[PDB]
Subunit: 357 residues, 4 copies
Amino acid sequence: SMDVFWFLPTHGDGHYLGTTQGARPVTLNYLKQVAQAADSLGYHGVLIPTGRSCEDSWVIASALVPLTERLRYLVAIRPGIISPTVSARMAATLDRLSNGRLLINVVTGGDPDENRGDGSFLSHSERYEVTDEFLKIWRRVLQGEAVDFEGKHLKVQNAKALYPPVQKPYPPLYFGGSSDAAHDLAAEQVDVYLTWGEPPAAVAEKLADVRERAARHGRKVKFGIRLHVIVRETAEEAWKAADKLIEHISDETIEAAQKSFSRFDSEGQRRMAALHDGRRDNLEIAPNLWAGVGLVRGGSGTALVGDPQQVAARIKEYADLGIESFIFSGYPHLEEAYRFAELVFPLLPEPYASLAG
Amino acid sequence: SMDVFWFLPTHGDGHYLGTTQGARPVTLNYLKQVAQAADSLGYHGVLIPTGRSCEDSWVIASALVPLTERLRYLVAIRPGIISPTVSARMAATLDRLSNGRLLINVVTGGDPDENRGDGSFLSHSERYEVTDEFLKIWRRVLQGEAVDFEGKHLKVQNAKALYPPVQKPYPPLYFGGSSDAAHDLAAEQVDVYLTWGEPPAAVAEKLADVRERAARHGRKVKFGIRLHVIVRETAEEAWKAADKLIEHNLEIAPNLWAGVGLVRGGSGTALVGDPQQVAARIKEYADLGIESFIFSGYPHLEEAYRFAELVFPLLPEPYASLAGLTGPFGEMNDVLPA
Amino acid sequence: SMDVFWFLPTHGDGHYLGTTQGARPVTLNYLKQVAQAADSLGYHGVLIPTGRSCEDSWVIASALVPLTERLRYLVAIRPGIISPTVSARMAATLDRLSNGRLLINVVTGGDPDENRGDGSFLSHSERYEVTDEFLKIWRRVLQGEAVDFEGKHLKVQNAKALYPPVQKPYPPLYFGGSSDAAHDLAAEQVDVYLTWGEPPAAVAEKLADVRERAARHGRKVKFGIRLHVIVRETAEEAWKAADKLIEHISDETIEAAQKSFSRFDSEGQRRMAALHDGRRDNLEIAPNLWAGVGLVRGGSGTALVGDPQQVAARIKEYADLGIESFIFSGYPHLEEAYRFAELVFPLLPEPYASLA
Amino acid sequence: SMDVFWFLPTHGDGHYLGTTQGARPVTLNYLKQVAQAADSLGYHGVLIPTGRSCEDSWVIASALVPLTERLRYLVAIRPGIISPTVSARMAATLDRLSNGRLLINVVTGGDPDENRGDGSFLSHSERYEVTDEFLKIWRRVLQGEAVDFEGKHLKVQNAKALYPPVQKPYPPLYFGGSSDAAHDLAAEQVDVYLTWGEPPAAVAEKLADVRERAARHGRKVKFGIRLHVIVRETAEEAWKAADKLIEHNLEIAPNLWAGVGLVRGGSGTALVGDPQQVAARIKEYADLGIESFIFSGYPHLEEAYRFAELVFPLLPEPYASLAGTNLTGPFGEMIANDVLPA
Ligand SMILES: Cc1cc2nc3c(=O)[nH]c(=O)nc-3n(C[C@H](O)[C@H](O)[C@H](O)COP(=O)(O)O)c2cc1C
Ligand SMILES: Cc1cc2nc3c(=O)[nH]c(=O)nc-3n(C[C@H](O)[C@H](O)[C@H](O)COP(=O)(O)O)c2cc1C
Ligand SMILES: Cc1cc2nc3c(=O)[nH]c(=O)nc-3n(C[C@H](O)[C@H](O)[C@H](O)COP(=O)(O)O)c2cc1C
């Protein structure tokens, strides 16, 4: 079993990182282009990021649902900035309009400056306490239960979502995080645990940690990985494109982003930045794993670079560890969605092997 | 100037009130029908209600934006249940995708049971205090400012909306309310004040109160009214349809029927009569300063066509010129209809 | 089995016949409204008329296909005015883009003035000869055959349709006609024979003739009927709306319309106009069968008028004769598509009974 | 004035010519992708080819009209296989539904085997005779006339198009042809004369011939050229992609590469070079009087973005300002979560 996702560039898109040269503005028409591409190419779904640097994920996903037939949408919810009852009604409404194509990404928010801008003045441990109480209300209201809940952070009385969702018991819960509070929350409530593109040894230990905590709660969680991808027909062209992606990234822009990443209260972001740390020589931190994207961009920071056989081999490495979901992205997002689907899909298991023509 | 709105029945639709007979379920397909009808008929926009009995307004409006060309969407925001910065980013994205077709309806929420279900335990005076602080943060972040704000209820530090809206300075703020705190809030921050379909004398006094308070703040507010409509070609058919609507004294004013208010629907009063009678009541409200008219009918799809074909030619421009590409008009295979 | 169709008013729509009062212009937006209504309400398909009085059927059907999911489109082809090879490629493309939702209505054209305007100067017998040779080439090219054909009217050499259709062997062929040449063509080539809304006794004889001729060709054809419908909650409201539909029809327009029909070289049009002769009194030619639409409109001319039980009863009467397809219409087409689907669908067989 | 068109690959698309490697099937979804790409990028329109090797142009164009806002469709009509009255009603209906976005490409058909497959057994001189009579009836019915016409090939009596088009007097007529019979027909009836991508000296001589014949009839025709284009940021990558396109001398003129003519593609020549070289060759053709430019690339979706992002700012208005919608803000991917792209 394997689900291959693509990515909607709600932060912005282009041919190069860091610079405005070759940039592509994010419009309704361009978002339609990427979503309808992933829909017709046969991708399982698309991940839609959230945050201050993005357009709103719920507005984007809701607008693209009537314009696609099979594509699923992994939309992010951020506990602490919205009522859990209201978030559930949004999830129910969007899941009903899409006829069961909604996927939920639980996001706790690792930037204290952005969180204070949204009105949240909570420590790292406190944010996961709100998320813990949030998900308990969210999951229960969506199953038709009039919820009475009074916790340390959230309190609802007769919380009801009158319109039931299509997917039972609720739209699947995806979650990413590397701290101990994140692994506990994932093991207790979520359905799929997501990690960024660390080397296989680091992901295997993170998966083993989550699998252990989930077993202690009598549950089993599925796993997925988030990666960039620069795949070409030959290995020489792929690494040539990787160097070309970052040719306009000055040293003062790398210092500007790293100064902002150190402000983050995120353990998952810390492990991603602990792979590059501003270096430019020796960026291949692992066989066909290139950490050049993390020099400027937040969140995901590594990419699989190589020919179709080299990239498909790295996928089997992660799949052998138990990872079943793969969320890819490329620059630019439209062109690379076709390139991955035409070079890598025939090398992947079904149904992706048979989607090529 | 006049803006004529229609209504999206996101709580549900049907042919009759009270009973489930002839009911029509709210689906994506039917919502497309009503929105695309109001879009092509030439309505200025549609009001989208909010509450526990409705589907989410932001999901529906966002889904209908790429499916319409000119129609505007009056979407409701609710302070107290969402971050003001995040609500502004939501408004910005929907306004950008729609190319300036987003209108904001500020709703405070008058049901204490529903408010407790959403996690808000605030009194009437407190609810308008959050709304006051909410709009100050909401309006300023959308104007490009990095907002630092610490009030009695809300507090943000370095609140920024990185994507600017299409409409400047922000999507217009519509607001409805009858208390003194609402009239003060409307006179200070909002752009359009909304009132229910009261008799013309009662609306004039409410408008005079808001218009007086707005002058003290150096502002002028526009006004709008929300009214159901049962218009037929003759007055006899209209009152026959009104009686049929509630078959499973009510005329509180000339051609103002309060039968819709018997149950918890969109409004509580309705204009019932022939096209000349309905246009006469509209001209009455317009003379008091009302420029926006938010209408609805049962069912909303059929009645959107009925109002637009019987009343639009009797209204000011551009609605007078919307009634009626050339060639044949009506069903022809050689002689054209004349 | 039963397939219920609706109708796209490409001639124009409105609340009243004959006059421009209460008319509704046919735009892309309004056609989207009616097509998307029939799609979501659960109708099997929509019939799209063709002719000089219509917008082009192929442009409209192709434009509405990507805007609907399940609805099928009964598009009309006219042999004699387009190449059979080209017509087949058009059908294949629309059938492929729609993923098998294309239905073909074979139209021969009964107006000699309109036919001469299109460049066809053929007698009634000759028109069915071109249609005969047209359909033979059309059906064979769509089955992957490089066709060589040299007939009295048409001649092709190496006619190929390189893109195969989705429905096999080809999109189903619907056909309407009342002449003897039409019954032969229907019995030999088409898949569904269509008739206008005549009384059940006259329809039963038309169906018996086509099934008799089809047996001599070793084939069996299915049958469908075309009707208007004015259904209300009560029988009094239905007859009140039927009288109201024709209140603005001029007596000069009645003679001017029937004068153009007396010049029509069509038996189906003559059998439909002879049910009224312009006489306005006593229009109910059968229980709940009202022939008021035929006073001005060509083609369909009768309507089922009554309460939901009366309308559903007349439908079952036609179904007992072997009619499986029902193509309904009302004025205006958008509102009345909802009215039929909400008043009559629960009284019909599945899947229409469970769609509400 | 300048109109830049793209191309809908209704015959098929892919990364390479001749081979099936990297091929891309023509589906409704992919045709939407290319059409909606040209729509948002700001192209004037798209050319839709016709023939036995294509899906029907009228079905595709009509299907794409409600899915686009400004993009125009240059749809081909072929006299001899359809009645002129019916063709006009089709043009009127599509022009009305699109609100004046329909363009007509008059195609006579140069393949006798394909013409015989469609039922036409006519010589070269005869084919242009039907086209002459076809356009005369087609143009007159669209202007509201009840047309009576009896020629050597076509005959109509009381031909009327009851629904008038949006563009007056009729959707513009584009036409391509190299024979003397074609140049006479173009100078007399059509609005835009189209030619393939010959070297600039040959195009100037063909355009002057049509302009002389048109002047003798008191008319003036506009001109357009059809070209492939392989434009990259550097000249070395462009020629590398051109060599790779046909791997499974050719530079017949400065930046004019004749590799597309090896197989039955869209045309036979291509502009290959850097953005500065391509815009220079366009300025050379534009100085001759060419106002319409119909470009294409392989694959058509990716290259529609590549030409529009590298060449549009170097072209006259409105294409120079199209590279920058009304939206403002973060132009590019956000650096971290608060640093605007440099
Ligand atoms: C696959 C994936 C997607 C994520 N998407 C987002 C996002 O859209 N917005 C965001 O603020 N954080 C996102 N994150 C980060 C986490 O949700 C969370 O904010 C951060 O990791 C803090 O958790 P931690 O301190 O336990 O590592 C994502 C993480 C992963 C693994
Ligand atoms: C259901 C139905 C639909 C028809 N639709 C058309 C049409 O769209 N255009 C048309 O010219 N004739 C139409 N006709 C009429 C016939 O197809 C035919 O063209 C004409 O009346 C000559 O046939 P006849 O002499 O055998 O009656 C239709 C007939 C039926 C029964
Ligand atoms: C821009 C352009 C586009 C053309 N498109 C087509 C087409 O789609 N199908 C086709 O058969 N011929 C096409 N042609 C060719 C002409 O229609 C015509 O068949 C050919 O020029 C033969 O005429 P000639 O002997 O006068 O040169 C095109 C020509 C040009 C210049």
